[PDB]
Write a protein that binds this ligand. Structure first.
Ligand SMILES: NCCCC(=O)Nc1ccc(OCc2ccccc2)cc1
Ligand SMILES: [Yb+3]
Ligand SMILES: [Zn+2]
Length: 610
């Protein structure tokens, strides 16, 4: 009707709108707090606007300055993962389009769900601490007060004081560094973002950061120790950027920097404008996990330019991005590779539907997050059910060239806007008006609103998948007399991508007999492989098949890195295996204070502790 964001307690975009944020703050590593001022330019959309509501979580409100003086504010009671509402009394009754600056001084709790503060022990260099944010989905409200909904877009400017030996970086173009006036011993790093973004894309890192040039508009940022390994790993970036512009239109953000974060960073990447954050688990040393870079580049259009209006429509962000990602890798390595990766995607979707259950609400494409913590709903479903829909539609409407024309125009039309599934679908019909009859063969109700597997499977080239299936199946159906025929030559012609897919297929049918999984380690030596995607699935397969020797390997992987994609299922498998159950829980209890806060709360929920 007139859409409301159910994950926000803030006044909606239909009442007022944040157009800009000015951010002055200092990063205190001893108190583990961000202190400062957050000045919001807000614009009324109705007449007689006498007060507005902002989202907060564990925020200490020092003062709220409007037009020079101090004003009357009022924090409501805590509302769970959502935090507490901050209703602000305005001294002037605002009328249509009239703007106002609400300057709000503030401190962040040390247990901010947006932030992980690391000690020197937890870093590579061992001598300096570190900070990083991760605002998506609704954690920006835990760094500063805001309409913490992606239905609102705002430019922002920032100045941030940090210990003089550490570097700050933000999701913005760097606007110079200068010694701090108020107290030496600290620099003040300055930042500006002229493209209006949703607040989930505001982002901050602070640490012993060096850089390295790997393309005309790209430096990799990490700690001394990883900088070199990473320059090698993400060399393909500029070439990916070029393809992405041919598919998406002009890359408008100015810079595309990459930041390789500490092992505890909870996702494969986060698409922070001008500075993409990635897991060091990408550092396989052969560029084989560069699809993740492809994916983050693509968010510079689908996500960051065209944005889900609410998190219910999150598939728009991820479905499109995965579609662009797979085009990028297709251009670089061939159409048969794009189909290989698309089919694996369907396989991940099958695992998601089986894990949640086929009638589960989070297997729907468009969801309802009323009273659900977004972090708990998060999964592969919006990624792979979304991709599957786009892929099916590509095939139905006359193929990738024709569908990529829809894509670029879709991006062009909704650029700098926040939109829903209906905006997307209404534009699909508009663009493809000469094929409306074809569009009406789509079971829109099933695809969009029904749980489980999609009602139709797309068509996939098999070239590269067949070798994975033959071998997965040989193992799944092996008896005693087959075990001596397996041999390291079985892998002679398989890429790392195919080893991974082979293990993914085998894992779908776990458990295998213990003797079989031992034999697999003997002929193939998967223990020696450091590729995190491969090691992950191999250790799942081992634990789920009751192999005790895999226990210390799986505990090591689950705690020495904390990308949730790997950490969560390794903990869960370890907990379901009777031999490792107690050690899994104890390991969790002993690590949970030095863990990222969203990851710690999720692993705790998975392990049914507290
Ligand atoms: N996009 C970069 C990776 C981080 C990320 O996407 N985080 C994130 C996204 C959505 C979310 O919650 C909303 C949701 C979950 C599942 C389905 C639909 C919406 C929570 C975290
Ligand atoms: Yb046999
Ligand atoms: Zn994404």
């Amino acid at each position: 009707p007139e859409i409301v964001d159910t994950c926000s307690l803030a006044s909606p975009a239909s009442v007022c709108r944040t157009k800009h944020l000015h951010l002055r703050c200092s990063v205190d590593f001893t108190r583990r707090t961000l202190t400062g001022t957050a000045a919001l330019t807000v614009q009324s959309q109705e007449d007689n606007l006498r007060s507005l509501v902002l989202d907060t979580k564990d925020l200490t409100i020092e003062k709220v300055v409007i037009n020079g003086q101090e004003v009357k504010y009022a924090l409501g009671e805590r509302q769970s993962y959502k935090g507490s509402p901050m209703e602000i009394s305005l001294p002037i009754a605002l009328s249509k389009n009239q703007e106002i600056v609400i300057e709000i001084s503030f401190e962040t709790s040390p247990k901010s769900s947006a932030l992980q503060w690391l000690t020197p022990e937890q870093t590579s260099g061992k001598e300096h601490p570190y900070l990083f944010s991760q605002c998506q989905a609704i954690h920006c409200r835990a760094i500063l007060p805001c309409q913490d909904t992606p239905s609102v877009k705002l430019t922002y400017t920032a100045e941030v004081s940090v210990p003089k030996e550490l570097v700050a970086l933000m999701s913005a173009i760097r606007d110079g560094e200068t010694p701090d006036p108020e107290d030496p011993s600290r620099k003040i790093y300055k930042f500006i973002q002229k493209v209006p973004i949703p607040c989930y894309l505001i982002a901050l890192v602070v640490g012993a950061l060096e850089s390295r040039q790997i393309g005309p508009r790209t430096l990799v940022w990490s700690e001394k120790e990883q900088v070199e390994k990473s320059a090698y790993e993400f060399s393909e970036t500029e070439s990916m950027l070029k393809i992405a512009e041919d598919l998406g239109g002009p890359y408008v953000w100015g810079q595309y920097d990459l930041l390789v974060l500490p092992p505890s960073f909870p996702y494969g990447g986060m698409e922070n404008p001008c500075l993409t954050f990635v897991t060091p688990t990408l550092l396989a040393g052969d560029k084989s996990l560069s699809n993740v870079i492809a994916h983050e580049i693509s968010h510079s259009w689908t996500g960051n330019l065209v944005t889900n209006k609410t998190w219910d429509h999150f598939w728009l962000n991820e479905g499109h991005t995965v579609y662009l990602e797979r085009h990028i890798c297709g251009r670089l390595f061939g159409e048969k590779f794009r189909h290989f990766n698309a089919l694996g995607g369907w396989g991940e979707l099958q695992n998601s539907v089986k894990t949640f259950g086929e009638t589960h609400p989070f297997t729907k494409l468009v969801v309802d997050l009323t009273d659900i913590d977004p972090d708990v709903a998060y999964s592969s479903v919006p990624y792979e059910k979304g991709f599957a829909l786009l892929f099916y539609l590509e095939q139905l409407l006359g193929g990738p060239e024709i569908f990529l024309g829809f894509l670029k125009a879709y991006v062009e039309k909704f650029s700098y806007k926040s939109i829903t599934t209906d905006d997307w679908k209404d534009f699909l019909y508009s663009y493809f008006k000469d094929k409306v009859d074809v569009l009406n063969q789509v079971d829109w109700n099933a695809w969009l609103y029904s749980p489980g597997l999609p009602p139709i499977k797309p068509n996939y080239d098999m070239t590269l998948t067949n070798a994975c299936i033959a071998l997965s199946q040989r193992w799944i159906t092996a008896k005693e007399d087959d075990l001596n025929s397996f041999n390291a030559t079985d892998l002679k012609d398989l890429s790392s991508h195919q080893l991974n897919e082979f293990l993914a297929q085998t894992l779908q049918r776990a458990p295998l007999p213990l003797g079989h999984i031992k034999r697999m380690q003997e002929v193939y030596n998967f223990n020696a492989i450091n590729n995190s995607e491969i090691r992950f699935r191999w250790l799942r397969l081992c634990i789920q098949s009751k192999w005790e020797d895999a226990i210390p390997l799986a505990l090591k992987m689950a705690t020495e890195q904390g990308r949730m994609k790997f950490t969560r299922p390794l903990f869960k498998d370890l907990a379901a295996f009777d031999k490792s159950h107690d050690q899994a829980v104890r390991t969790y209890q002993e690590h949970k204070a030095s863990m990222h806060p969203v990851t710690a709360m999720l692993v705790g929920k998975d392990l049914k502790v507290d």
